[PDB]
Design an enzyme around this catalytic site. Structure first.
Site, PDB file in Angstrom:
ATOM      1  N   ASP A   1      -2.515   5.503  -5.018  1.00 27.19           N
ATOM      2  CA  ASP A   1      -2.700   4.520  -3.952  1.00 27.19           C
ATOM      3  C   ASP A   1      -2.914   3.055  -4.402  1.00 27.19           C
ATOM      4  OD1 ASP A   1      -3.277   3.467  -1.413  1.00 27.19           O
ATOM      5  OD2 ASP A   1      -5.039   4.744  -1.047  1.00 27.19           O
TER       6      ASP A   1
ATOM      7  N   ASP B   1       0.794  -1.240   0.000  1.00 29.35           N
ATOM      8  CA  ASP B   1       0.000   0.000   0.000  1.00 29.35           C
ATOM      9  C   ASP B   1       0.826   1.290   0.000  1.00 29.35           C
ATOM     10  OD1 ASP B   1      -1.993   1.960   0.473  1.00 29.35           O
ATOM     11  OD2 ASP B   1      -2.293   1.370   2.571  1.00 29.35           O
TER      12      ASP B   1
HETATM   13  C1  LIG Z   1      -6.209  -3.017  -4.305  1.00 32.98           C
HETATM   14  O1  LIG Z   1      -5.951  -4.026  -3.305  1.00 32.98           O
HETATM   15  C2  LIG Z   1      -5.794  -3.465  -1.991  1.00 32.98           C
HETATM   16  C3  LIG Z   1      -6.796  -4.104  -0.993  1.00 32.98           C
HETATM   17  C4  LIG Z   1      -8.229  -3.551  -1.157  1.00 32.98           C
HETATM   18  O2  LIG Z   1      -9.114  -3.992  -0.102  1.00 32.98           O
HETATM   19  C5  LIG Z   1      -9.273  -3.308   1.128  1.00 32.98           C
HETATM   20  C6  LIG Z   1      -8.618  -2.073   1.397  1.00 32.98           C
HETATM   21  C7  LIG Z   1      -8.789  -1.420   2.623  1.00 32.98           C
HETATM   22  C8  LIG Z   1      -8.056  -0.104   2.881  1.00 32.98           C
HETATM   23  O3  LIG Z   1      -8.755   0.872   2.634  1.00 32.98           O
HETATM   24  N1  LIG Z   1      -6.742  -0.034   3.316  1.00 32.98           N
HETATM   25  C9  LIG Z   1      -6.096   1.260   3.625  1.00 32.98           C
HETATM   26  C10 LIG Z   1      -6.102   2.361   2.537  1.00 32.98           C
HETATM   27  C11 LIG Z   1      -5.266   2.125   1.267  1.00 32.98           C
HETATM   28  N2  LIG Z   1      -4.321   3.251   1.168  1.00 32.98           N
HETATM   29  C12 LIG Z   1      -4.216   3.918   2.472  1.00 32.98           C
HETATM   30  C13 LIG Z   1      -5.606   3.714   3.086  1.00 32.98           C
HETATM   31  N3  LIG Z   1      -6.504   4.783   2.734  1.00 32.98           N
HETATM   32  S1  LIG Z   1      -7.468   5.465   3.853  1.00 32.98           S
HETATM   33  O4  LIG Z   1      -6.808   5.522   5.150  1.00 32.98           O
HETATM   34  O5  LIG Z   1      -8.752   4.782   3.750  1.00 32.98           O
HETATM   35  C14 LIG Z   1      -7.579   7.104   3.096  1.00 32.98           C
HETATM   36  C15 LIG Z   1      -6.282   7.872   3.371  1.00 32.98           C
HETATM   37  C16 LIG Z   1      -5.216   7.778   2.458  1.00 32.98           C
HETATM   38  C17 LIG Z   1      -4.031   8.498   2.702  1.00 32.98           C
HETATM   39  C18 LIG Z   1      -3.915   9.333   3.836  1.00 32.98           C
HETATM   40  C19 LIG Z   1      -4.970   9.411   4.758  1.00 32.98           C
HETATM   41  C20 LIG Z   1      -6.148   8.680   4.524  1.00 32.98           C
HETATM   42  C21 LIG Z   1      -6.023  -1.286   3.620  1.00 32.98           C
HETATM   43  C22 LIG Z   1      -4.747  -1.533   2.763  1.00 32.98           C
HETATM   44  C23 LIG Z   1      -5.872  -1.543   5.143  1.00 32.98           C
HETATM   45  C24 LIG Z   1      -9.629  -1.990   3.595  1.00 32.98           C
HETATM   46  C25 LIG Z   1     -10.275  -3.222   3.358  1.00 32.98           C
HETATM   47  C26 LIG Z   1     -10.125  -3.886   2.114  1.00 32.98           C
HETATM   48  O6  LIG Z   1     -10.769  -5.122   1.832  1.00 32.98           O
HETATM   49  C27 LIG Z   1     -12.078  -5.490   2.301  1.00 32.98           C
END
Ligand SMILES: COCCCOc1cc(C(=O)N(C[C@@H]2CNC[C@H]2NS(=O)(=O)Cc2ccccc2)C(C)C)ccc1OC
Ligand SMILES: *[C@@H]1O[C@H](CO)[C@@H](O)[C@H](O)[C@H]1NC(C)=O
Length: 336
Positions: free
Chosen positions: A222, A37
């Protein structure tokens, strides 16, 4: 220090929404399915110390430090507040194996892992590919520790995300890029500031007109996000233009109206990055009697990073991405 090595991690494509690889933690290695990530800078896996009352922990691989001879205690509390859902636990150190590269790394042992969204997670944990500036507890990110070893040919890493299937789900190259997965030449865009994998976006167009991001906006590139996302406001305008209707967690169109939807373009640097309806609609059927989801959703990322758009797996599937730490820039080429 620069070496003569590149290493690759093969990824699994789960339903075009989750892309994950494998890492080993401890001696002997305990294997975990992790998301690489670029939107985060921490390494974390579920812990053996996680209460079996969290159903997520019953359904994922847990790190047990009592089975590792290379484990070094820390115990500092850690809370990672992702806007999709929060995780907490504590800091630990052990040897992590990622594509042959063995590195001593500090990571979080998660003890509180909510059913939403982790019960839907195919992966166990996360490997943050972001910068130390965005690392909670100012823990050194894994790429910074790999760079320190002076073994990589270049201080860069690349992402390839394939379309779902016997085929390759995707690939991360550490120390370079794989030309077998891109074509044409890379077009770079410099980061606004170091510490984030965020670049300037000059406009978003539906059809042939810059209906959005007219006065300029931000684009977080991202790898850990499934979709292309924008602010609640931007996505509302975008969807209204598409003819898509808002459900509880997504937007849908009638399946029969999917192929007919217009191209969505993103002006980044000196290039227009265009996605057709085939690139952003989950065309499950062509029925007038069924609803089809889009790979674009609303997400209000908080400041300092936000408000910002996020170019997730929907974007990376179309465009092979190179993250250049040496020159603080992101390169894009058409994925092969
Ligand atoms: C494509 O394959 C990837 C897997 C896709 O599945 C999932 C992903 C997630 C998910 O959202 N994650 C974190 C986000 C990804 N990047 C940072 C974070 N963004 S955030 O915190 O939501 C906005 C932000 C950004 C930057 C700064 C501040 C705030 C994960 C990796 C824990 C959750 C459940 C999933 O599966 C049911
Ligand atoms: C945890 O690691 C950090 C690394 O800088 C260190 O300063 C801290 O004292 C460690 N805590 C323990 C209890 O080892």
């Amino acid at each position: 220090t620069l070496g003569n090595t590149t290493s690759s991690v093969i990824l699994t494509n789960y339903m075009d929404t989750q892309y994950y690889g494998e890492i080993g933690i401890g001696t002997p290695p305990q294997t975990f399915k992790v998301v690489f990530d670029t939107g985060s800078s921490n390494v974390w896996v579920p812990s053996s110390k996680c209460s079996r009352l969290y159903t997520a922990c019953v359904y994922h691989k847990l790190f047990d430090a009592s089975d590792s001879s290379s484990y070094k205690h820390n115990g500092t509390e850690l809370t990672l507040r992702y806007s999709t859902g929060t995780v907490s636990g504590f800091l630990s150190q052990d040897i992590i194996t990622v594509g042959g590269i063995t590195v001593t790394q500090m990571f979080g042992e998660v003890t509180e892992m909510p059913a939403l969204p982790f019960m839907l997670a195919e992966f166990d944990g996360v490997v943050g590919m972001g910068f130390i500036e965005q690392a909670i507890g100012r823990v050194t990110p894994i790429f910074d520790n790999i760079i320190s070893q002076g073994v990589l040919k270049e201080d860069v890493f690349s992402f390839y995300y394939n379309r779902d299937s016997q085929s390759l789900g995707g690939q991360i190259v550490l120390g370079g890029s794989d030309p077998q997965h891109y074509e044409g030449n890379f077009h770079y865009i410099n980061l606004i500031k170091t510490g984030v994998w965020q670049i300037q976006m000059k406009g978003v167009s539906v059809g042939s007109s810059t209906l959005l991001c007219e006065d300029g906006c931000l684009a977080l590139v991202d790898t850990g996000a499934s979709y292309i996302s924008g602010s609640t406001s931007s996505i509302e305008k975008l969807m209204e233009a598409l003819g898509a209707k808002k459900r509880l967690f997504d937007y849908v169109v009638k399946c029969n109206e999917g192929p007919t939807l217009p191209d969505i373009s993103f002006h980044l640097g000196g290039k227009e990055y265009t996605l057709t309806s085939a690139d952003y609609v989950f065309q499950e059927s062509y029925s007038s009697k069924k609803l089809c989801t889009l790979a674009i959703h609303a997400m209000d990322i908080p400041p300092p990073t936000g408000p910002t758009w996020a170019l997730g797996a929907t974007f990376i599937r179309k465009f092979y991405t190179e993250f250049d730490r040496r020159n603080n820039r992101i390169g894009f080429a058409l994925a092969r």
